[PDB]
Design a binder for these strands. Structure first.
Lengths: 94, 95
DNA sequence: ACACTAAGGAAAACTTAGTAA
DNA sequence: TTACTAAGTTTTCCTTAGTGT
């Protein structure tokens, strides 16, 4: 998991490390420590946990695993598109 | 990491589990077991390893962590596009 | 409040060994 | 060959407890 992506999206959601952990299912007495290790690169959440985090952060989970800033923005933008716009991007390269 | 993405990409690259592991720097005696566990969901590789797999598999790594099939397809296509065509999509992905 | 950290106990991965398909 | 697993160690994470910012 990329810590730049966690941080950025968390800031954009405008919440603390701890409240992110709490909203994602981590006990209040571990949330702050755990989310900080995640965000400072000390440990990695498992994939289940990153899914909960992403839901909480309102992003597609794969955004947290995308090193390419351009592809990352495409994923981000694709997240707010409707099936109309999403399909028209589908055949857009086809 | 999503086991189906790993499997589908490994089969599209046309190599076996063991060979993929060896090309990712896993000792040849650990590779078969280790890649099999990854692809059956017994165990999950770390992101550093996932990056090495993607490189072998000639894919963007985040493909392996995309549950949405339509986003995953978008990722693969973007993958194959050259630098110039990336501008075109980028321009459209804006505002 | 919020961010951050070492240290231990707990959990999950890696290596080994070997069996089918 | 290629796919796959149980076991025990290694490695990593999760919890605690608490400092700094």
């Amino acid at each position: 998991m990329l810590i730049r992506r966690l941080k950025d999206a968390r800031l954009r959601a405008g919440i603390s490390q701890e409240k992110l952990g709490v909203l994602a299912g981590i006990d209040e007495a571990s949330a702050s420590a755990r989310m900080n290790q995640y965000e400072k690169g000390k440990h990695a959440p498992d994939f289940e946990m990153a899914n909960r985090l992403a839901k909480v952060l309102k992003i597609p989970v794969s955004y947290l695993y995308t090193p390419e800033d351009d592809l990352a923005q495409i994923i981000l933008t694709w997240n707010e598109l409707n099936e109309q716009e999403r399909k028209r991007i589908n055949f857009y390269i086809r």
